Design a protein around this ligand. Structure first.
Ligand SMILES: Cc1nn(C)c(O)c1C(=O)c1ccc2nnn(Cc3ccc(F)cc3)c(=O)c2c1C
Ligand SMILES: Cc1nn(C)c(O)c1C(=O)c1ccc2nnn(Cc3ccc(F)cc3)c(=O)c2c1C
Ligand SMILES: [Co+2]
Ligand SMILES: [Co+2]
Lengths: 383, 383
């Protein structure tokens, strides 16, 4: 059931912005680890005396990395005279965010028809304003409201590359890396209390609950009208034998924030081969693979969707598989992206629900908790 | 002339410590860009609730990357009960350093015979104490005094891998990268006033001035008894046509700090081939190469040291060449390591002064300023 209750016209995920202490080193690490190209910049070389911002792209996926310069470089400026290309940026907010949370997502940006309208309707419907609508070069409008913790939902609308004031990156500095990642599938937040978080966000967006089918969490997924913008939210389950990973996140992150980004691949096998080649040479590590009992149990569950060779290829790469009543998904999770056990990345590919592919085809893999537990004691018994 | 006036026994450079906002991403970028292996760690997985520290090695070169965790993880601790592996670490100092300077060197560490003695004699001779001597696991002693800006000179002495509380990194996570870098040759500071900086440091170390042979700077080099610990210091020259790069550093760094690290290669041609292959895929960029007039002028200056092919190989890689009355050096400079135009790296190889090779063989390349200017207008005229 999809009531299509969006209070304003939402298009697609537009970009994700990381707040960094040094944007250069994070962007270069991510570029190599994920196979994303350097595509735009806004920094001292483009006249920006306020912040350094570097944009990586792979397909339609856009990762922005931003860090503050010394405030002394821009001490003469006022907001009317700012050289910042992102007017919502604030030195104090950025430094406070990174010292509080470490490396993490500041903004989940979605493209909308009219960012000023989206902002007004959101705030009229309970959203906490973060940055009012600002029109950039009479061409693009940006506005921000609080999502959870210190994460903002950023509205972007275009009258008609990335943002005014950003320059395209020269070919010499722009190596065409590509490991197959194509777009952001969903972005997941961790909060202490799911109920009030859901009520707040569904309250100001009109996003509806996306239907699903003791793992340490309770979850729910908010979705736009065509279910292409997907925002899951988790809360911890306390008292459990194993401590909730949601609680660990909240402790090390100093509260609520973005837990993981799920990146759709057009060929998850190629993506994982390329990423795993680079894990120990600057890229990303992956969670430990499931036991072979898990892959021995895959024939009975998805043997009609994946060949034996394709299942063996999942085993080689540590890929997980789950299935809806309507589709199948392949997924795998990285280890945390930075020092703290907080944000990580999921790589995903979805099989089915063809019409284009409908959003969320196959679900989000919640069945992989019990299957993993089931594989673990089975492999212990086989030993 | 070398008076050998060291006030305590100094051995070699031991390590360089970067203070980071996220040590993981910087260490992974540097590892790939410079061909350094992950060799030790101290972090949550080793019981350290205070800071994340990752050690990269190439030959005898040791780069340490450290960032703070949330203070809440260690709020119950006191210094007697600390889980920090580096007792001088302070959350507030680290956050203040990185917000003030961005990514940069906090500590230049030298190995000494007796770190407590080195500390006492230094402070008795004018050094500003930063962290008193602390004995780690009855095995290693560490102490720190101020060097310039917020950079400390760290004394390490061993009674008898890296530091107690660090664990060696597992083979799977430790890929044996190596592009030929072997040790730290020198570490250079920028200050507003050279005179008082020299008087202070030579005052408490007994380091002597290393003899040399309008570029925007005045410089002098302090050296230990065997001239293997080399600490150059620069001040800006104001009024010049082109603005001093030393002044630009001081402005963007918010004052004095470490300007560049010079890393000796056992084969600078291999090192530069390997680094340049990776510049646009996560590694380091290099300054723009000199005009071919520079290499056309190399035959007359070093044609007795380098063959024509070896000179052509310098041209392919953008390497610079300078010569003493006693030796020749090959050198090249990276672009800044992070967002700000502050710290960069120099790769160097020295030819001559065999006895082992004596320190500073060939000088530091100060002659390359006039040669570069001379190449530039010559190439303009040839056009
Ligand atoms: C649920 C779920 N609900 N919604 C809306 C989602 O998007 C999801 C997921 O993506 C999903 C699905 C299956 C999984 N199976 N195992 N693990 C183990 C683990 C990995 C990294 C850690 F730091 C700690 C534990 C997972 O994390 C896991 C996730 C995170
Ligand atoms: C001097 C000197 N004295 N001592 C004790 C040293 O160690 C040195 C050097 O290493 C040395 C030698 C020759 C050079 N020729 N050209 N450039 C251009 C440039 C590069 C990066 C920038 F951000 C701005 C300008 C240099 O920097 C340069 C250096 C830095
Ligand atoms: Co997910
Ligand atoms: Co130098």
């Amino acid at each position: 059931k999809n009531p299509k209750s969006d209070k304003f016209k939402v298009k697609r995920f537009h970009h994700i912005e990381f707040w960094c202490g040094d944007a250069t080193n994070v962007a270069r690490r991510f570029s190599w680890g994920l196979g994303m190209r350097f595509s735009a910049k806004s920094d001292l070389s483009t006249g920006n005396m306020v912040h350094a911002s570097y944009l990586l792209t792979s397909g339609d996926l856009r990762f922005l990395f931003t860090a503050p310069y010394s405030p002394s470089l821009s001490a003469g400026e006022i907001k009317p005279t700012t050289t910042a290309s992102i007017p919502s940026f604030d030195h104090g907010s950025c430094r406070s965010f990174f010292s509080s949370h470490g490396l993490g997502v500041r903004a989940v940006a979605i493209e909308v028809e009219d960012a000023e309208s989206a902002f007004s309707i959101s705030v009229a419907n309970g959203a906490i304003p973060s940055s009012p609508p600002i029109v950039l070069n009479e061409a693009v409008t940006i506005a921000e409201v609080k999502l959870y913790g210190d994460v903002v939902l950023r509205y972007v609308s275009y009258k008609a590359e990335f943002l005014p004031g950003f320059e395209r990156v020269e070919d010499a500095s722009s190596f065409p890396l590509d490991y197959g990642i194509r777009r952001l599938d969903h972005a997941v937040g961790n909060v202490p209390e799911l109920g009030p978080a859901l009520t707040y966000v569904a309250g100001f967006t009109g996003f509806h609950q996306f239907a699903e089918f003791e793992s340490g969490l309770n979850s729910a997924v908010l979705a736009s009208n065509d279910e292409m913008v997907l925002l899951p939210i988790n809360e911890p389950v306390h008292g459990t034998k194993r401590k909730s990973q949601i609680q660990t996140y909240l402790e090390h992150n100093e509260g609520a924030g973005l837990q993981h980004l799920a990146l759709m691949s057009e060929d998850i096998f190629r993506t994982l081969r390329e990423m795993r080649k680079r894990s120990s040479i600057g890229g990303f590590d992956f969670m430990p693979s499931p036991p072979p009992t898990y892959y021995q149990n895959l024939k009975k569950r998805v043997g009609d969707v994946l060949s034996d060779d394709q299942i063996k290829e999942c085993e080689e790469l540590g890929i997980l598989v789950d299935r809806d009543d309507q589709g199948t998904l392949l997924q795998i999770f990285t280890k945390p992206l930075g020092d703290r056990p907080t944000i990580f990345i999921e790589i995903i590919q979805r099989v089915g629900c063809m019409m284009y592919q409908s959003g969320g085809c196959g679900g989000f893999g919640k069945g992989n908790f019990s299957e993993l537990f089931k594989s673990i004691e089975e492999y212990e018994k086989t030993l």
